[PDB]
Amino acid sequence: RPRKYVFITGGVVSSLGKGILTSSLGALLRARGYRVTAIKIDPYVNVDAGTMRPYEHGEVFVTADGAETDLDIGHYERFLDMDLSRGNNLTTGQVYLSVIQKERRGEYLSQTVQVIPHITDEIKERIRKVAEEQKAEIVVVEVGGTVGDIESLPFLEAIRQFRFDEGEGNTLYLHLTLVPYLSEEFKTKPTQHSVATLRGVGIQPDILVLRSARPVPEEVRRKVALFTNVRPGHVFSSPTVEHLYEVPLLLEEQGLGRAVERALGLEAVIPNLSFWQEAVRVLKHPERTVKIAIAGKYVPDAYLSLLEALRHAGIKNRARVEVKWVDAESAADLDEAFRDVSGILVPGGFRGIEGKVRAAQYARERKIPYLGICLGLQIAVIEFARNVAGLKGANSTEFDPHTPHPVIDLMPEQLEVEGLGGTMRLGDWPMRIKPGTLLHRLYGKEEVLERHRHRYEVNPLYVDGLERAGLVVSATTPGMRGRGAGLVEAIELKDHPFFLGLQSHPEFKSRPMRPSPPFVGFVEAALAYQE
Amino acid sequence: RPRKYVFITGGVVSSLGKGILTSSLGALLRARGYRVTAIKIDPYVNVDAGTMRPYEHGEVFVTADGAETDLDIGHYERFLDMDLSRGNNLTTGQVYLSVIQKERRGEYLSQTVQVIPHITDEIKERIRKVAEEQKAEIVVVEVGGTVGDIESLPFLEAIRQFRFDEGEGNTLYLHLTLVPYLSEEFKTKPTQHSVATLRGVGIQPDILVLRSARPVPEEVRRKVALFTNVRPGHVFSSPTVEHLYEVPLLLEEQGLGRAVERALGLEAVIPNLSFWQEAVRVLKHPERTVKIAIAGKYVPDAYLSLLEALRHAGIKNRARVEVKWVDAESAADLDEAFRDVSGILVPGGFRGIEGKVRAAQYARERKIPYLGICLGLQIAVIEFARNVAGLKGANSTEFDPHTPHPVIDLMPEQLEVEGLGGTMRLGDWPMRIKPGTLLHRLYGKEEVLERHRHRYEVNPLYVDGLERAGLVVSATTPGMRGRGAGLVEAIELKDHPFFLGLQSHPEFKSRPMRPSPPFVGFVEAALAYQE
Amino acid sequence: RPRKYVFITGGVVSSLGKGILTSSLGALLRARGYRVTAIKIDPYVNVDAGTMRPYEHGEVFVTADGAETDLDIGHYERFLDMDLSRGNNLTTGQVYLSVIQKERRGEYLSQTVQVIPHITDEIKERIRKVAEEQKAEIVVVEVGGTVGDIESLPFLEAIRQFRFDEGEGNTLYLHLTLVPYLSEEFKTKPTQHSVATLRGVGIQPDILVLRSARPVPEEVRRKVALFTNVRPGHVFSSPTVEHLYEVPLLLEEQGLGRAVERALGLEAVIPNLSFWQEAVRVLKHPERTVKIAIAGKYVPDAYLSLLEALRHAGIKNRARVEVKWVDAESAADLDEAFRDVSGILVPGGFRGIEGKVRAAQYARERKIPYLGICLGLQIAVIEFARNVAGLKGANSTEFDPHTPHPVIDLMPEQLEVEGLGGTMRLGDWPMRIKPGTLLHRLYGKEEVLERHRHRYEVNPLYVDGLERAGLVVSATTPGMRGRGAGLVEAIELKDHPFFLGLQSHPEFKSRPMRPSPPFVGFVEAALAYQE
Known part of the structure; x- marks a missing residue:
């Protein structure tokens, strides 16, 4: 059977909880019996979190194989309940260094090497190699950075190419945006602009998740759907919550899990979220x-x-x-x-x-x-x-x-x-x-x-x-x-x-x-x- | 006295003779007695033209210091009549490798390293260092690639930052575009779109040069000026010609040299183009x-x-x-x-x-x-x-x-x-x-x-x-x-x-x-x- | 002496208090002895607020001449202390109807009529005519809608053309954006994107005003300045306040008034804001x-x-x-x-x-x-x-x-x-x-x-x-x-x-x-x- 790819991008601003979103979707998929894995793309130039302050400006996670990675990897391991490796934290430094070393060694057989297709090829190959060794049927890839910036560009392009490479039904695209709440009025303009910029670089999101203080009502979600080209039923909310463990339960409730299965052409599987439900019960009481x-x-x-x-x-x-x-x-x-x-x-x-x-x-x-x-x-x-x-x-x-x-x-x-x-x-x-x-x-x-x-x-x-x-x-x-x-x-x-x-x-x-x-x-x- | 920077970008399509444009402007400036130099930015990942076919897909020039560079460097040496070095051919591979090596050695003191400001800082520093050692009062920098593509982005951003760093009157921006000729109608839409994309990344050209089969008439040039935000007198033509040596003579004739002096706040100097004039005379007769x-x-x-x-x-x-x-x-x-x-x-x-x-x-x-x-x-x-x-x-x-x-x-x-x-x-x-x-x-x-x-x-x-x-x-x-x-x-x-x-x-x-x-x-x- | 134009646009989202901003700048200018006026552009198709609910969905102001306009006009009259007319509320319906009527009557002498230059000419002419009859030396024009949307496009273009038509030193552009505050972190990404979109349509703001819960610190304002191409001293804050009358006092305090005078090439005049100061004193105590x-x-x-x-x-x-x-x-x-x-x-x-x-x-x-x-x-x-x-x-x-x-x-x-x-x-x-x-x-x-x-x-x-x-x-x-x-x-x-x-x-x-x-x-x- 074909491997499935679920890509996740962010827009408007950073700090929308995209890491917990990736983790929460990964958990929803695992609660369905699938073999899953997650890859965190960090557009920064650092080859790994090795030369960074281990605690000071954020914790540096460490994988079983001794890799010093971004802290999201820890979020992934906890929500997916699995051991990840250094291949699960991809950065600009890794990709460029690895490509530059290859052409200095003449491995590109004298051709002129460019961001496209060489840097982008390197990126896709790294995504597939890691997914291969960890034998995942569904791989959730999170693109760090914010759509509209310069740094994530090589990565947005790399993942856009997956649709053609993998064939119909095997790739899905989610985009997380900020929807400020004033009036009791939800401001959808920023996500309209973000998605429009995204399409501009060549990607059409299949699913939208709207970050806001409270859930975005159906009326507003429908309007966003029509101006973004996304099905009304594929626009979801991401309200701020007391306990992170609530996120997956919340997203499954709205139907994100259902939507992802369908969009990937997988027959509906009823997820067992008993653990998350009990953990949140214990946490609230x-x-x-x-x-x-x-x-x-x-x-x-x-x-x-x-x-x-x-x-x-x-x-x-x-x-x-x-x-x-x-x-x-x-x-x-x-x-x-x-x-x-x-x-x-x-x-x-x-x-x-x-x-x-x-x-x-x-x-x-x-x-x-x-x-x-x-x-x-x-x-x-x-x-x-x-x-x-x-x-x-x-x-x-x-x-x-x-x-x-x-x-x-x-x-x-x-x-x-x-x-x-x-x-x-x-x-x-x-x-x-x-x-x-x-x-x-x-x-x-x-x-x-x-x-x-x-x-x-x-x-x-x-x-x-x-x-x-x-x-x-x-x-x-x-x-x-x-x-x-x-x-x-x-x-x-x-x-x-x-x-x-x-x-x-x-x-x-x-x-x-x-x-x-x-x-x-x-x-x-x-x-x-x-x- | 302050060093002056003249940046040159290209739009719509490549292959508009941007290299001869850079060379021709450099010659115009030298014919005025200034100490000049030119830097060719090649957005490709190759560190230098060393691992490329020396003749096959284009000649690989060699500088006095033994550097294997892009062929434009040869155009520069011939038109500026001077010896250039490897610092005059800047590439993506050089900039990224050099920045990646620095953070692995921990030289970035534990900060997270990013395209902006780190990759961009590296780029500007390389431009200044080369201009320093070659003691140039005016440096012409050509950005390879085409505005609107992904590869040249780090470089367009780096040079945009020069305006603020250098102060008023010390930086000038030229943009070369394609103006197809049908009807006897000149199609200005492509350059309107190119310039608009350029402004989008943060750069406002001061001077426009329009590549076309024949010179673009004044009426058309004026229209382009008003919709691009560029002074009518700062829009020039770049017609196809029989002999390359005609280019500088042609551009000076229209007033490009005059416009550049003024835009840089330099008192008018009458250029001595006797050599170019004689060379073209001998070539035509x-x-x-x-x-x-x-x-x-x-x-x-x-x-x-x-x-x-x-x-x-x-x-x-x-x-x-x-x-x-x-x-x-x-x-x-x-x-x-x-x-x-x-x-x-x-x-x-x-x-x-x-x-x-x-x-x-x-x-x-x-x-x-x-x-x-x-x-x-x-x-x-x-x-x-x-x-x-x-x-x-x-x-x-x-x-x-x-x-x-x-x-x-x-x-x-x-x-x-x-x-x-x-x-x-x-x-x-x-x-x-x-x-x-x-x-x-x-x-x-x-x-x-x-x-x-x-x-x-x-x-x-x-x-x-x-x-x-x-x-x-x-x-x-x-x-x-x-x-x-x-x-x-x-x-x-x-x-x-x-x-x-x-x-x-x-x-x-x-x-x-x-x-x-x-x-x-x-x-x-x-x-x-x-x- | 030349008439001065100060244009004001909004970005990211609407509802940032752009009307009070226009009014507050108008007051600052009047407190300097200038003869001023303000024009509210409303991109909607309604010819005037005549067929709209007079109270229900917002009040419909009425000018001395019997015009039924948008409520901002009332804000203008109160802050500028002056009688405005229907010419001070310009809409899409007015401009298009007026232009369509002219070509049906054959007044365009058989030419094909287009948004540019005909609709845009109509817009500029309406702005000048009103400013003429009200003999204003400085006219503050507010563009309704949000940069990035379709409706305001004809108007953003019309006002861009003023710079060339009026000559250097006679036009100034301000852009108001939303800067969400999380962490104590100010999110500048949205304004970076808004300004970039603005430049894309051909306008470079001279002054930026950042709407946020609290004033944006100098460090953040400087960063915004460098990536937008705006002078650090031309980036201001617009914090939420208890009394609207505080706005002008606040903006003058930061130096907006000073910046506008200079940018327009007018010799510094010390404003008399005694009235506003007393009114706010009475309001707070x-x-x-x-x-x-x-x-x-x-x-x-x-x-x-x-x-x-x-x-x-x-x-x-x-x-x-x-x-x-x-x-x-x-x-x-x-x-x-x-x-x-x-x-x-x-x-x-x-x-x-x-x-x-x-x-x-x-x-x-x-x-x-x-x-x-x-x-x-x-x-x-x-x-x-x-x-x-x-x-x-x-x-x-x-x-x-x-x-x-x-x-x-x-x-x-x-x-x-x-x-x-x-x-x-x-x-x-x-x-x-x-x-x-x-x-x-x-x-x-x-x-x-x-x-x-x-x-x-x-x-x-x-x-x-x-x-x-x-x-x-x-x-x-x-x-x-x-x-x-x-x-x-x-x-x-x-x-x-x-x-x-x-x-x-x-x-x-x-x-x-x-x-x-x-x-x-x-x-x-x-x-x-x-x-």
Whole structure:
């Protein structure tokens, strides 16, 4: 059977929730039993999100294969419930670099190389290759940027060519626009202009989705349909909502799923959205409520996946997890700052370390549930080494390269591989959990995979000592490709309600349908502490 | 004083002679005493014309610095009478590669990199850097491609930004369009639409040039002026003409030069166009006429510079040089094929060698003026080695790598430099001419520079022998950067009216104001042979 | 000296307050001593607002010359403090009808007539003719509709042609756009696209005004400036405000006035905005506060000028006039409906009459200040005739054509003029006020002009009787062109704090700088009643 392509573009302005739209349509299609995948096109020149601030100006997601991508990929994995790869984040830098390298190597056999057809060919081929390896019957492609700008032009053209290449019934085009609401009057002029510009570059949308404060009434939607050339029944609303998980349920309700099936010539399949329905029920009507503090170094979307993991966890506990932001780098005031808190979470980063060290001490001495992710584990290791192992001024050579006790340092030279020096650990790394530990109790397995993004590890040489002082290493890595063999992956304390730290980013793999165990435990313990 | 920028764009269709327009405006400005330069923007992805067919689909020009550029650069050098560099041919591949390399190296300090402002900044900086090193007061920039297409978009935007960056009075914009002529009716609709699209991307042309079979009458030009927002006096004609050298004279006549001075706030300077006037006089009223044959391997624009050199030469001889194209690779029929010919020229290339070998033999035995360029010299060396030195099956290892006598082969290992193996000789190479020779008689100097583009040289080991058989080496190279020291640059025969060959491409440096000596001699000798 | 033209266009969406923008710029220019005028272009096909609902879907303003125009004209008169004519409201119907009539009469001398130049010529000529008769040095023209739509196209083209026709320095172009505000992020994409579309039709704005919830910061304004081709200092903000009168003060503050003077090559004049400053002071800090009820038949902008008159009045009384909307057509409940009210106003119309009759009775018997406009006077006449003159079932033949007492009926046949039958009275009509009356006390003159828009008059035959029953006719009309000679223009009662009715629409001539006397009295009396 023919593979189907659903393209999604945006108009008028950006920030209309096009990523959640892509994710929501992907979920609707999966709830129908199809094998699906999503590709995020980012018109920027960056080859990948590798040279960008990992938290600062938005979170940089990390795929199982170690790719550093745009945060939308995380939205896709969570809504489609699947592992994506670096091929799912296509950028201008990738496409142009890849094409330029080919002609310098003379691979274009002496022809003059141009945006069309060469850059556009490269783009389509990349879309098909990824869809091929992930064996998808339906692939949802989101074009980043805004129709009408210069950057997305090569991509709008590339996807326009799919209609002819794939044959009738195999491609569908959706365009998301902004419909400001004043009067109680909906202003449709901007979407009329956006669609007109779109047709100008050669694309006729099949389906329109109108972003606005509230749903666009039928009368208005019909008018938009007639002046855009789109069937009235193919114009939908995208109202602002309280919970993102409402989006798919809402879109299916209006008939977007039905419209897409038909437009693609697929026989109607009744979707099973029971999960989304229950998740939204739990979200609107929590059974309980507990607040936890995030002593973060970056107090938007810097912790997108993190906050998502907590939400997936609260649902699993039928509880609304309220988040308190504690600067941490801001001194002695830990009693008030953690008063109405029942759990303390220290997330990753790469400045305010000393402030976080204090947050861990307080949580360890006051018996407050503590979860440490990436840097969060290192901090707990650092403060433990100081205040329990008596290692004066213990630290990571990241913050203090001259510390007398580098309990945390770069990849030991003994476990390093040729040509990989100075490269952090990325993507899935195997983790061997220790039976009888808290970790083991949370996961329920001995071998699991968790994603990483860091270049500092617990110094092997200080392990024996820290363990004697009471620190527990509930997990390590048998290594990978002969690298980092034996490195500590998790730590915890026995005489404590809940004190756990992991070197990986478990938020990344967290899914609404499968909460990350470390977070499920954190929220659970937090509830216990609350009484 | 402020540097001035004159941008030139094209609309409706390509192939309107925009390159000659740029060149003609550059000449008009030079005839006024200004220090000028021209930059050719080629929207293609190729980093340079290096991986393209050197002759086949158009000639690839070579600058003094060894850059392989688009052929327009040659038009610029000839009309502006100056040496340009690789910085004068800007492409999409250069700009994107250069920007992509910078962000992978993290030089963009973690920001997200985009076409605007990063790709556009790169473009403007490249335009300014080149204009800086060549100390130009006025720089004419030609944007390749056609307004309305996707590829030139980053460049149209980059140059639009110059107006603000440079301040009032320092930038001017010209747009060339097609005005079809039916009825005796001139169709202005296409240029109305082109200009409207141009304004759409943010540029308002100051000057319009209308390409058409004949000049566009004042009535029509006025109408175009009013609907485009351009002053009536700033709309000019570009009629098809017999001789390209007529273009500048024609444009100055209508007042383009005057308009540009004013628009740039420069006090009127009366241009001295005496040279162009005389050259066109000689071209329209030749004193004599001689035909010569070009036994070329590529029998358009494959020999652009070559044909230009011959024209510059004919003018210096007050004679119209008619060119006969002899396939060469097509057997025994040399009497008819060279009947009404008074000179035989064998140009460069990298197939029909055996056919050319025959053309050289005939010209040597029949006392017919012979000029050999690049391969042309090697061929003459090959046929001489065979038929005069008795070297059976002598050849170049390029055509016969197994010949028993590689009289012509790759760069001898003794004269090669580390890391430069397999790289041909490019750009200016010093040539030491031998006194008393024909070469010496033509140039009138002992040391000159000529441009190269080839990876095969006369085998040093066969020189002594060939010289004893009567071959003369009237020039060699003291080398360059310790490479190719001693290589033969030219050959000739004593008992012959005119038999000369050079390893370089002397056409490249030929200028209308300064004909290349080797060609001046060729045409002169050709005339002698004619009687 | 040359006449100056300031054109104003709108983009992205309509409803951005472009009318108040035009009015506010007009006021800024008048505060500088210039003779100004404004022209409202309405792209609709209606020849004038004559066949449109006079109140229902927005108020239809009426000029001194009896023209029924769009409501913006009222905004212009109030802000520019001047009388405009029908030539100040230009529409598509006017322009096309006028051009079509000319070619049917063969006035185009057999040429083929087209939108360009014929329709466009007609448009420019109409703009100049009106500006001529009103001797304006600066004329502000507002183009209705939204750039990007089909209807305004002929007009955008017409005004583009002014630049060339008028010469340098005499025309200026402003474009108003929507800049949505999310994040605290201002979305500039829509205005970038709007301006780009504008340039596409051939116009380059000189000044930009950005409509948004709050003022657009300098950083954002600068970015918009660079991508639109507009000087940074020529990009302004138009934030939403509490009082419209704040707009001019705000725009002058940012420097719009300064920018316009300069752009038009006029030497800086310091504007006297003392009036606007004081009016806004009084509006933000009222001395007192009184609420009055409007028993209207149309309970938006249906009473634009009406509400404006009340505001001008409250300012003159240093009091905030709160308005209560009483349906009137909705029965016995007059005590609650008028509880917290200190004045009852019955406005014009042409259904719920019986409901209004009751409102007048209550206000007359309870000694509550009463002001009747147009129908409001007739109603007071009708209820007086019934409840005081004992004329059972008295009425207007408009509501009851079969009433036994048509105290109000159409223009008496005795006072009608040939060919004017069935045509209501429009524009200024002279009114002779009677000394010693309340009317006379309010105006302070014996002869004044007030605008009309109605076809029903008080029956002359019932006057004598009503006067004996206590009704006072404090004003009549000596007629006009021999029509309606002697008709009643106003009525009132002696034994009452304030009971006054006028047949004209005094709201229409009301100005912020000169409140309409009838309203000044109403608000004053209302305050008295309040104690």
